[PDB]
Amino acid sequence: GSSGSSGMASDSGNQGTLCTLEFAVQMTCQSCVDAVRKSLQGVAGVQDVEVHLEDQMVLVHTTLPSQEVQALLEGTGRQAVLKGMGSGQLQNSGPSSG
């Protein structure tokens, strides 16, 4: 008799990409704005974070998913709602009618 078989699969998987995450955080006074920013201020992973008190918005430029940042944002005590998990701009060429 004789036999021979195998079932191995090389282990190779790279997952890493920096994207912009828009989170609508309900702010009231500076404090809230100071805490929201700090919560993600120079924090491992996070590369940038924008906080708009005018539109109670709060962006977060990190390689981590919204589900990951969401928790970090909620940790401050406020409610972080996802209003955009991506970006994209479309330009147009040609003369305009004026």
| DSSP string over the chain | ------------------EEEEEEE---SHHHHHHHHHTTTT-TT--EEEEETTTTEEEEEESS-HHHHHHHHHTTTS-EEEEES--------S----
Please name the method used to determine this structure: NMR
Q: What is the DSSP letter of 3?
A: -
Q: How far apart are CA 77 and CA 8, in angstroms?
A: 47
Please name the fold of domain 18-86.
Alpha-Beta Plaits (3.30.70)
Radius of gyration over every alpha carbon of the chain, rounded to an integer in angstroms: 21
Q: Are strands 19-25 and 80-84 parallel, antiparallel or unpaired?
A: antiparallel
The Cα 68–Cα 60 span in angstroms is 11
CA distance 27 to 46: 21
Phi-psi sector, 53: left (phi>0), alpha (psi -120 to 50), beta: alpha
Per the annotation, binding residues are 29, 32
Gap between the Cα atoms of 82 and 74, Å rounded: 12
Q: Which residues are annotated as a binding site for Cu cation?
A: 29, 32
